[PDB]
Design an enzyme around this catalytic site. Sequence first.
Site, mmCIF file in Angstrom:
data_model
loop_
_atom_site.group_PDB
_atom_site.id
_atom_site.type_symbol
_atom_site.label_atom_id
_atom_site.label_comp_id
_atom_site.label_asym_id
_atom_site.label_seq_id
_atom_site.Cartn_x
_atom_site.Cartn_y
_atom_site.Cartn_z
ATOM 1 N N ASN A 87 41.029 35.679 43.887
ATOM 2 C CA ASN A 87 40.982 34.246 44.036
ATOM 3 C C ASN A 87 39.648 33.752 44.486
ATOM 4 O O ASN A 87 39.478 32.563 44.677
ATOM 5 C CB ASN A 87 42.084 33.787 45.023
ATOM 6 C CG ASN A 87 43.472 34.152 44.578
ATOM 7 O OD1 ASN A 87 43.761 34.374 43.371
ATOM 8 N ND2 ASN A 87 44.395 34.150 45.550
ATOM 9 N N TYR A 143 45.003 48.399 43.825
ATOM 10 C CA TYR A 143 45.250 47.341 42.785
ATOM 11 C C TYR A 143 44.976 47.750 41.355
ATOM 12 O O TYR A 143 45.238 46.985 40.406
ATOM 13 C CB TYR A 143 44.398 46.135 43.140
ATOM 14 C CG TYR A 143 44.781 45.505 44.437
ATOM 15 C CD1 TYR A 143 45.913 44.684 44.536
ATOM 16 C CD2 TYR A 143 44.010 45.690 45.557
ATOM 17 C CE1 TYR A 143 46.269 44.078 45.763
ATOM 18 C CE2 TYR A 143 44.335 45.076 46.756
ATOM 19 C CZ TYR A 143 45.476 44.303 46.856
ATOM 20 O OH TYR A 143 45.735 43.762 48.067
ATOM 21 N N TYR A 177 37.891 39.936 45.613
ATOM 22 C CA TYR A 177 39.277 39.569 45.462
ATOM 23 C C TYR A 177 39.510 38.464 44.391
ATOM 24 O O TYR A 177 38.705 37.611 44.263
ATOM 25 C CB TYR A 177 39.962 39.137 46.797
ATOM 26 C CG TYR A 177 40.034 40.289 47.800
ATOM 27 C CD1 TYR A 177 40.908 41.370 47.572
ATOM 28 C CD2 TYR A 177 39.252 40.295 48.935
ATOM 29 C CE1 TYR A 177 40.997 42.411 48.460
ATOM 30 C CE2 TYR A 177 39.340 41.335 49.823
ATOM 31 C CZ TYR A 177 40.214 42.367 49.565
ATOM 32 O OH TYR A 177 40.263 43.379 50.420
ATOM 33 N N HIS A 195 47.720 42.112 37.652
ATOM 34 C CA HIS A 195 46.648 41.205 37.964
ATOM 35 C C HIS A 195 45.239 41.835 37.727
ATOM 36 O O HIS A 195 44.253 41.146 37.956
ATOM 37 C CB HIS A 195 46.723 40.757 39.422
ATOM 38 C CG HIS A 195 46.667 39.277 39.671
ATOM 39 N ND1 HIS A 195 47.080 38.308 38.773
ATOM 40 C CD2 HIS A 195 46.327 38.609 40.798
ATOM 41 C CE1 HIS A 195 46.996 37.116 39.341
ATOM 42 N NE2 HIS A 195 46.484 37.272 40.539
#
EC number: 3.1.1.29
Length: 168
Positions: free
Chosen positions: A58, A15, A56, A20
């Site tokens: 969220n 990531y 993560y 994001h």
Amino acid sequence: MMFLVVGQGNPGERYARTRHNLGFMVLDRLGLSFRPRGEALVAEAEGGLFLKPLTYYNLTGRAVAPLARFYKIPPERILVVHDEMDLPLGRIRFKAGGSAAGNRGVLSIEEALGTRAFHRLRLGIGKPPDPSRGAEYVLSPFREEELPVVERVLEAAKEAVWCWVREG
């Protein structure tokens, strides 16, 4: 601890370049020394704390709330730096309280803290051509043609962060 600056992102090398993870990218420009503390990378500078949660995206509230609660950091001195599809790349906006405007990282911190009254630094990344591909778009890297803009956004974000922390 005077304050808490939270960079939104996802853990892991896969990531690290994605849109994001722009909040992690800002945090990584600050000159700090991050150490692992549970599901978090944490740095201490200028009497306060800097956090790249490894929860993560969220689920970042799970790292933010225990830290804020413990050191009694009020919500007025919590800043959440995140990518924002509702603004074009190049645009940066502060936001004080009000709705977690569908940002699920900001929403998870509101849930875990029990308040909307913390600050956010919104870093525009634009929208995908089709709404249903939002997750795909944010979990993609920037286009190489965006990189010059991204850089300057990171430079402006770095100054905004320190401004928020310090003088203003």
